[PDB]
Amino acid sequence: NQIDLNVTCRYAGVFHVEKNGRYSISRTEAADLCQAFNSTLPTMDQMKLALSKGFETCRYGFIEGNVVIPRIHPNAICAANHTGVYILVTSNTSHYDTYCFNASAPPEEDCTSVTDLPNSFDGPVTITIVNRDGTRYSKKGEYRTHQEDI
Ligand SMILES: Cn1ccnc1CCN1CCc2cccc(N)c2C1
């Protein structure tokens, strides 16, 4: 009963989280997941400022209202060579990664590890935060509030 959460650097408070390294988060689970990090789904404006500080990924994830990929450098296999906050327009499917925004993070690039999941609640799951440098933090808990997500 284990979940890996792979997390990025923060840029103006915004970071990317993937569950188990595969697209597998619903829109309801995304809000709950960010809440566990004392964070919210980013607005478009928050994501655009993050972009401007150096944030980019090659993964679709939820923000408030849309599913996006932030892109700085054109890559043909990431958002069809687009730059900017690329908005997913047409998809059949409902499960992506998520972005999260933490107001209490540093204003620009913060590439320190994440060492806590501060607002997780009591539960049976071993949740492991996995940083890109491999640093891990585990705790037993739960973050999902919606039954359809478990
Ligand atoms: C190529 N691929 C497939 C699924 N995700 C990716 C790229 C994103 N990576 C995937 C692996 C990983 C491991 C630990 C921390 C972070 N942030 C990441 C982010």
For this entry, resolution in Å reads 1.4
9: Cβ below 6 Å to ligand 1? no
According to the annotation, is 132 in a ligand binding site?
A: no
User: For 57, left (φ over 0), alpha (ψ -120 to 50), or beta?
Assistant: beta
Alpha-carbon distance values, 38 to 13, 59, 81 (Å): 11, 22, 33
SS3 35: helix
The answer for residues whose C-beta is within 8 angstroms of residue 75's C-beta and 6 or more apart is: 58, 81
21: Cβ below 6 Å to ligand 1? yes
One DSSP character per residue, 84-138 reads EEEEP---S---BEEEEE-TTS-SSEE-SPP---TT-EEEEEEEEEEETTS-EEE
Angle, vertex CA 39, rays to CA 18 and CA 96, nearest 5 = 25
Q: Quick one: which H or E segment has residue 126?
A: strand 121-131
Spatial separation of the C-alpha atoms in residues 109 and 105, rounded to whole Å? 9
Structural method:
X-ray
Cα of 132 from ligand 1 centre, angstroms: 7
Q: H helices within the chain, ranges in order?
A: 27-36, 44-52
The torsion angles phi and psi of 132, rounded to 5 degrees, stand at -65, -25
According to the annotation, is 22 in a ligand binding site?
A: yes
